[PDB]
Amino acid sequence: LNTILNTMSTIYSTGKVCNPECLLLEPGLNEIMANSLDYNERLWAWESWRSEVGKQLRPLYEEYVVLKNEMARANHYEDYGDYWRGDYEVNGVDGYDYSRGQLIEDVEHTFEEIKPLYEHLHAYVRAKLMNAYPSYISPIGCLPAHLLGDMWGRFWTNLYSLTVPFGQKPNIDVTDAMVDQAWDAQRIFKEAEKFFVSVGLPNMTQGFWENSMLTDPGNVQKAVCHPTAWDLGKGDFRILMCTKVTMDDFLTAHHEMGHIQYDMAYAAQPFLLRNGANEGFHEAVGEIMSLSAATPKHLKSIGLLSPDFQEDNETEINFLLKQALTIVGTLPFTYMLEKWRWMVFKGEIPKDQWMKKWWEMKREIVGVVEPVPHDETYCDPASLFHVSNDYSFIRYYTRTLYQFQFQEALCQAAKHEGPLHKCDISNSTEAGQKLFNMLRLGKSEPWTLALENVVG
Amino acid sequence: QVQLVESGGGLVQPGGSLRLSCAASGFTFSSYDMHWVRQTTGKGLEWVSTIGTAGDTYYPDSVKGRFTISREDAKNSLYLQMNSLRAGDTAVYYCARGDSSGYYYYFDYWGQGTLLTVSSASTKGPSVFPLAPSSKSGTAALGCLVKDYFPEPVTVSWNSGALTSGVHTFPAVLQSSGLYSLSSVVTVPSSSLGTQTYICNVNHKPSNTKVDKKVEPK
Amino acid sequence: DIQMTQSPSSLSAAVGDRVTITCRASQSIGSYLNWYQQKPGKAPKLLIYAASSLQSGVPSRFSGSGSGTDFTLTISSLQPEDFAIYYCQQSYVSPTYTFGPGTKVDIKRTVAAPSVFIFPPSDEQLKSGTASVVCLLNNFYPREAKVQWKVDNALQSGNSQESVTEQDSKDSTYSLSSTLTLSKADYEKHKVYACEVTHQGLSSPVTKSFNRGEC
Amino acid sequence: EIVLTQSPGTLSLSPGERATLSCRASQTVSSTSLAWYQQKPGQAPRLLIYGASSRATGIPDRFSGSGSGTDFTLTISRLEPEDFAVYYCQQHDTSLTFGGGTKVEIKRTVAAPSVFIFPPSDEQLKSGTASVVCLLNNFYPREAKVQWKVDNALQSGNSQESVTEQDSKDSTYSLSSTLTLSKADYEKHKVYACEVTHQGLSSPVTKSFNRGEC
Amino acid sequence: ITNLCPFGEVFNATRFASVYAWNRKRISNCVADYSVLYNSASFSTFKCYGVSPTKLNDLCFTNVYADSFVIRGDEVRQIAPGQTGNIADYNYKLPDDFTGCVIAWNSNNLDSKVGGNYNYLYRLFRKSNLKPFERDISTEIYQAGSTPCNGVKGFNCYFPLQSYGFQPTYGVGYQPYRVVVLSFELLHAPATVCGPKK
Amino acid sequence: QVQLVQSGAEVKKPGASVKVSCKASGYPFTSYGISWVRQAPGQGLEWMGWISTYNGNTNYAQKFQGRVTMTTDTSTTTGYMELRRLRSDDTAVYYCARDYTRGAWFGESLIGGFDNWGQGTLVTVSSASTKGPSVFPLAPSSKSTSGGTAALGCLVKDYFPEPVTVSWNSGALTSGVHTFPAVLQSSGLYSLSSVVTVPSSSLGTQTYICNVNHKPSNTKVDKKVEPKSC
Ligand SMILES: *[C@@H]1O[C@H](CO)[C@@H](O[C@@H]2O[C@H](CO)[C@@H](O)[C@H](O)[C@H]2NC(C)=O)[C@H](O)[C@H]1NC(C)=O
Ligand SMILES: *[C@@H]1O[C@H](CO)[C@@H](O)[C@H](O)[C@H]1NC(C)=O
Ligand SMILES: *[C@@H]1O[C@H](CO)[C@@H](O)[C@H](O)[C@H]1NC(C)=O
Ligand SMILES: *[C@@H]1O[C@H](CO)[C@@H](O)[C@H](O)[C@H]1NC(C)=O
Ligand SMILES: [Cl-]
Ligand SMILES: [Cl-]
Ligand SMILES: [Cl-]
Ligand SMILES: [Cl-]
Ligand SMILES: [Cl-]
Ligand SMILES: [Cl-]
Ligand SMILES: [Cl-]
Ligand SMILES: [Cl-]
Ligand SMILES: [Cl-]
Ligand SMILES: [Zn+2]
What we know:
The structure is cut from a larger assembly and holds chains A, B, C, D, E and F.
Chain C (H helix, E strand, L loop, with lengths): L3 E4 L2 E5 L4 E7 L7 E6 L6 E5 L3 E2 L7 E6 L2 E6 L8 E7 L2 E2 L3 E2 L3 E6 L6 E5 L3 H6 L1 E11 L4 E7 L2 E2 L4 E5 L9 E10 H6 L2 E8 L6 E6 L4
Parallel strand pairs in C: 2-12
Antiparallel strand pairs in C: 1-3, 3-8, 4-5, 4-9, 5-6, 7-8, 9-11, 9-12, 13-14, 14-18, 15-16, 15-19, 17-18, 19-20
Chain D lengths: L3 E4 L2 E4 L5 E7 L8 E6 L6 E5 L3 E2 L7 E6 L2 E6 L9 E6 L5 E2 L3 E5 L7 E5 L3 H4 L3 E11 L5 E6 L2 E2 L4 E5 L9 E10 H6 L2 E7 L7 E6 L4
Parallel strand pairs in D: 2-11
Antiparallel strand pairs in D: 1-3, 3-8, 4-5, 4-9, 5-6, 7-8, 9-10, 9-11, 12-13, 13-17, 14-15, 14-18, 16-17, 18-19
Chain E lengths: L6 H5 L11 E5 L2 E2 L11 E7 L10 E2 L1 E10 L13 H5 L9 E7 L1 H4 L9 E3 L18 E2 L13 E2 L2 E3 L12 E10 L7 E2 L4
Parallel strand pairs in E: 2-12
Antiparallel strand pairs in E: 1-5, 3-6, 4-12, 5-11, 6-11, 7-10, 8-9
Bound molecules: a molecule of 2 linked components (NAG-NAG), 2-acetamido-2-deoxy-beta-D-glucopyranose (3 copies), chloride ion (CL) (9 copies) and zinc ion (ZN).
One chloride ion binds next to strand 4 of chain A.
Organism (chain E): Severe acute respiratory syndrome coronavirus 2
Protein name (chain E): Spike protein S1
Membrane topology (chain A): Single-pass type I membrane protein
């Protein structure tokens, strides 16, 4: 099984297709699927990845399913999917228990409730894509998989260029205001620290300021510039970030410092209970921070927008559309992928129907159709990193829902008026208290209770 | 008679600074430890700072780095410098003498207190209006209304303090406008309304307001 | 540090009654305990030090007992001037001396009906554009009292604020003010201004009223 | 023994420059127990730093101590004229030992020596000994080569050198070379030369006299 | 008497003991100038028990004892009468009627080392809590179950000491703090340690 | 106010002994130890030992373990360092210093250094005997540049012990003077030179006398330095 896992990982990471010069998934094929507007080019890259890698992975994946299921049943789970769903299980706490099967019921219920919004977003995106790819798309059919803005249609983000509702209304970008006021990475992180202090949370530790790496160290040394929040233990908290003076990096600093605030809150818990209440909690905490920081209310408050800046319905709809393309777009994709995997682990999909069911579900659940017929020699789900590298996926669905649960609860505590997307929790110690009442638990209480502490 | 008298409390903006003074009399000031103790409705009596007779100073952690106690024995004086003031420092500040019998230490003498208000709002001085005694009546009632002032406190006396019996100076009330309002009344013999002059003396130090209002039957 | 706790939170007793208050330290403090008395608007006053030593000049009815973690302050015969909050304070750990939260000692006395007075707004205030009407309830007991404003026999709501004095140290009564606030315009629209007072010491509500332009 | 090595022996810097002085211990030294001393010519040493980083009384802010394990550093942020002296480190982690010292000299532009030669006095000769003196005056840097020749024979083992402290105003050095001969040898030979090689000289400068010259 | 008590030798020592093997110095027959301890820019804790710090130079004692050691910042609170925790229970215990002072300061720049300074240890397991002023320096294997350990670490058999492993990048709660406890001992014997005012 | 005053300079023959005293003042004597350090001509600092003023405990450098003895007198707040079986290379300046590296009471190591130092005591160990210098002229060259600069001086040779002092024209001439550090000759006697640069034109008019004083032999010499005479 370890040989299988390593082989699948390496085949995904080193896979490259050669022009009938060779292109590797990152950055080449990803660049094509992000920015190319040629139907044929996109189709080639999509099919090429599916064939070059998926066909190779197919047999390895078959063996992987068998061996993972043996492991799971040896641990008294029904299958590997049941094994994964264990990561939400709670026992022994009356009034707070949560069964592994309950996860499927609740995910399917909430997705049934998301269906109307997704259908209408889908119709809108299909209309615009029809304008962009005239002859290739049907006005009542699913969306060709290779036209969705990335290699799988996991997020519809890069479709914004093709779907922006009000193309003459620019988006809000205070980067120029940051550069005109001579901002540096330190200023960004000091403003984030101020944000958290405003809700009653503590300052960053002196050690944080002394030991983090908040800018690229230059040519002296090479560094892994992926923004990351570090909890080394022994009271040592750090951030690694090659910060640039940019709005995106300002928001990312807020997100990562939200991770740090979480770590600091549960540092008083026993070692093995120092973590999020479940796999989705941490990233949700991170996201709500960037949510509050990016609002025009907040940017005005910290002097990055002029007090005379007027908002307008068209720009807000622009922003909400983009946000949907990412957030709402990925929800059916995530549910359908994990549903396929759950069913394969349970043994409900014969291998002879693997790809068949896959595309059936793609058509039925997420409204996406394959441009080329694929047979059972392929393995399209394994063409995604999480599948070929053995990661559960429903965490993304769960975290996304938790995000707005948290934000709604905190905006309520912050007596916010008007639409939720315009809400900034700054200066609300009530919301800070509600949030800390969960952060402080870490993994010591059922996640049902952790969630209840925030949202009731 | 040992006496301690605080001075210097008032309105100060957040992040601001302010010095309190305490004047001592009636003992050998240099021979005793001196202390600052503050009081709030929410947290009760709280020790703020201590200075011994050897120049030694002591602070709680909540206050170290922000406040500084000192003493001027030549002027029988005690000082508390306060920097980086926060809303939570709003309180009544007492100076207090410390003394000991054997190993048992106690605070045997306290000043009267001085109110520190930490707020970004602005000072406003009161308007003082007469509450005129009824022409109809025996015992009669009269008074003064001190309206629309900030911050606390105002002090009210009658006939320059010659009138104390029967006086009720009510606790201030915070109006919806953010301003305080108060009224001081006194009951007197009806017959005295034509044989005694009644004047209320209102003082609001934060606005340097001193008013003497004569209250007369109409 | 050492946390100090007092019991009860408040207590009502009659003049001559034995009053008994207790103090607890979060750990043993031997006899390093002081008691202070604080009357409204005044600074604390030291009554007891070293758990049982009566400070010079303090009346002999005050006494302190106790050792280790539990301590008692006793007033052998409550006097009216003893209405106050009593605090204990541990002297074992310095410089971090800590105080208890306080025990309120209220005086129980006979029912006393309020004396009721009404005050029209001054002319100077009317020149400023606002009218304040004041109703005074003087020297009553117990503290529970209700005052209702009537303008031309129309009951008022939301335009009045009340204030109550602390218990009087001589006669143990309370006094109360109610202030009705009107715009000069609203004040000049009506004629009869009355406050109706309900208190347990009165057989029937007492109303004091005046007409706008009469003396 | 814990041996402290200070390098370089002489550090040449201009006034106003930063100075970082190195003390390397042969094995780890507890930071609690490393100190720095200053010493000026003809003066007792003065304590500058103790506990690796703590300043002693009356020592200005420009002096700083840092380091740990085996590597310690004395930093003078802005050299004042009064700072050009010798600096010793010291440890008492194990027994007690001093470093060899580092001298901080004023770096100056190159200055060639003015060279002079002095024959023995007749008074000295009457005593049975002859001293020949060669003077190198006001030169920088301090390093210089001085060679004695007697009728072309290179002298060895019979000369002694002395060098002044760096001048307060010129920041130059002066050096003397004294050749000691017997009266017999001095009167046996004719040409006495001192040849000076120094960085500021285009070619070596020779100064000579012939016994008898007027 | 004219010799001053050697408080500087205690507070300014290069080496401090591990808290399980805490150091004690006996100070007698000397004039104690406590003024050296007033307004220190280094002390993060200065508490006295049974006497007031301001009055220290007016007091006389039979002996003064100076215990000193290193712990972490989070544990300084345990160095007081009436406390609980690993330090108070198994390492250094003050009596309920303690008369003395406790002083502490951060020593991150002396006692931490990149990679860890493992010389500072604390006792983590003991069959019973220490009596006041008891020092246990045994290294007997802790038996947590019914099975004898026979002197070897193993299942339910733990080595009783643990190392702080101080590193300078630790948070404050985990950084080394040096602690000095001065005990003021008053017997029925003539006072040998007096302030300058007595 | 802190002050350490050391005894005067010493001359000793090989195998003799020397006792250097150190009067401390301005601080509590018995609270600090006394450390001793030595410095040979032109060399670095060398630790000798430490003594407690409280209980007389000592700690000596291994190099001097059998030859040195440190003592204190409390009544006179004085320390003493005795070095025995003196060798030639014991010649050095000997400093006492107030110690804050090892505790007076408990003898354990302290965060600190040697914070106050005496002025030092020169100890010269030589089989030589007191001798006043011979003073010879270093005459200005007949080849001196007209309108330029000439050099003249005094050779002060064969004296013992240190020091000598040298002035020019009784202190009137100071500019351009270099009095060199003495060197120890192979004879065990010291010699130095004092030189000065002057205007060549001056040699015809001005007189140049070096005044040499060697107090150890009560020798005083004034030497007139003349040009040419060939
Ligand atoms: C530990 O050593 C320090 C010096 O390193 C002592 O501090 C000195 O104390 C005296 C007396 O108060 C002062 O006059 C000096 O100015 C202080 N110097 C410094 C640099 O702080 C300290 O007193 C010693 N500790 C004890 C307990 O004596
Ligand atoms: C946070 O840090 C800032 C730094 O200037 C300080 O002013 C503020 O008081 C700190 N607040 C808290 C709660 O630590
Ligand atoms: C939060 O409060 C601070 C201080 O009152 C103020 O400067 C800032 O603008 C406020 N921001 C928001 C979003 O309320
Ligand atoms: C923008 O939204 C607000 C809130 O619903 C609405 O009142 C207003 O009419 C809208 N304006 C436009 C131009 O759509
Ligand atoms: Cl991340
Ligand atoms: Cl951790
Ligand atoms: Cl796919
Ligand atoms: Cl991805
Ligand atoms: Cl200096
Ligand atoms: Cl030593
Ligand atoms: Cl040495
Ligand atoms: Cl003891
Ligand atoms: Cl030691
Ligand atoms: Zn994240």
